Write a structure and sequence with these properties.
Blueprint (H helix, E strand, L loop, with lengths): L2 E8 L14 H14 L2 E4 L13 E6 L8 E9 L2 E3 L5 E7 L7 E8 L1
Parallel strand pairs: 4-7
Antiparallel strand pairs: 1-7, 2-6, 3-4, 3-6, 4-5
PDB class: viral protein
Keywords: SARS-CoV-2, fragment screen, Nsp1, KIT library, viral protein
Assembly: monomeric
């Protein structure tokens, strides 16, 4: 399928144990997609002071359209030193590995895969 229905655990930035997916734009997008497929991906909602507490490169989920079955259609955009790789809509948050942190909520998304 070109899209996959996912429910992403929303983590508080100070709980996150693994604060990024790797060391290159290509690696973080790769690893983010693998964790999304394996159900081991969390979401941190972006507010003042969140991103400096996470590791670059960043992987964002961004709204790709204006929401089947409650699931917002999203795609991945990476960012490294202020340059984004991808073009999409509003940020829903930044993806991080999930290694068992307790979430505060779930974000239903339809991921363009």
């Amino acid at each position: 399928k070109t899209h996959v229905q996912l429910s992403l655990p929303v983590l508080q930035v100070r709980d996150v144990l693994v604060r990024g997916f790797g060391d290159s734009v290509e690696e973080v997008l790769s690893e983010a997609r693998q964790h999304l497929k394996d159900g081991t991906c969390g979401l941190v909602e972006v507010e003042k002071g969140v991103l400096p507490q996470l590791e670059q490169p960043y992987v964002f989920i961004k709204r790709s359209d204006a929401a089947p079955h409650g699931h917002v259609m999203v795609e991945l955009v990476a960012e490294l030193e202020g340059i984004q790789y991808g073009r999409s809509g509003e940020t829903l948050g930044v993806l991080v590995p999930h290694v068992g942190e307790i979430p505060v909520a779930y974000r239903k998304v339809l991921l363009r895969k």
